[PDB]
Amino acid sequence: TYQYNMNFEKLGKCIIINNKNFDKVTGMGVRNGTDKDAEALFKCFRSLGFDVIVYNDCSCAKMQDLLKKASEEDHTNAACFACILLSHGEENVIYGKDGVTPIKDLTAHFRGDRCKTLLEKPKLFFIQACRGTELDDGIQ
Amino acid sequence: KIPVEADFLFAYSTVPGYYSWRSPGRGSWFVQALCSILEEHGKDLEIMQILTRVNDRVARHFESQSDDPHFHEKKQIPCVVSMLTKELYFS
């Protein structure tokens, strides 16, 4: 009574957006190691049971369209949805290869009123990206 | 009725306002730790248990190495935002 129902045909869809190379006009450098991340996440989320697809060096419009379309698919036979964002970023905002786009705009497509077939089902967002420029100096 | 914002979970690599660290030869700290925990326990722990162990692993196992001393030996804690209404197991 206290768990999400998992008795569906599919675990669900998992979208990995792996942004390594950025346009000169953005000024952002290459994210070395992010391919190692994406392949490790691919194996893990596949092992969990997600139908995983990786999309590389996406533009802001492609990220928005990828997530808008996924939101419009039929998830009746899916238990949940996951999306993983690997990119440069700043607070509330993530880099496409051609600029910044707000994270809330990527996720709002999955709101209860905009995606009925995921209603009452977990929608999960894993976000590797900066949220500002403060350093945690740590303490012993 | 049911809130339109319910049943989201955001697993951020870092806290609001802060850097997120990445090793060029091994990958980002958060993802290294997340994959570690998922290989061992993805199927028998609840999502908040998995992500709490990830928090601990990023907080303890990683320390930045850098030429610039402004960025020498810095630390990171990830940040989980849960609007979940039930426990979540992947099985």
Binding site: G29, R31, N32, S87, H88, G89, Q128, A129, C130 | S13, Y19, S20, W21, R22, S23, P24, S28, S64, Q65, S66, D67, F71
Partner: peptide
């Protein structure tokens, strides 16, 4: 040599 995002 670590980097940030």
């Amino acid at each position: 040599x670590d980097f940030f995002x």
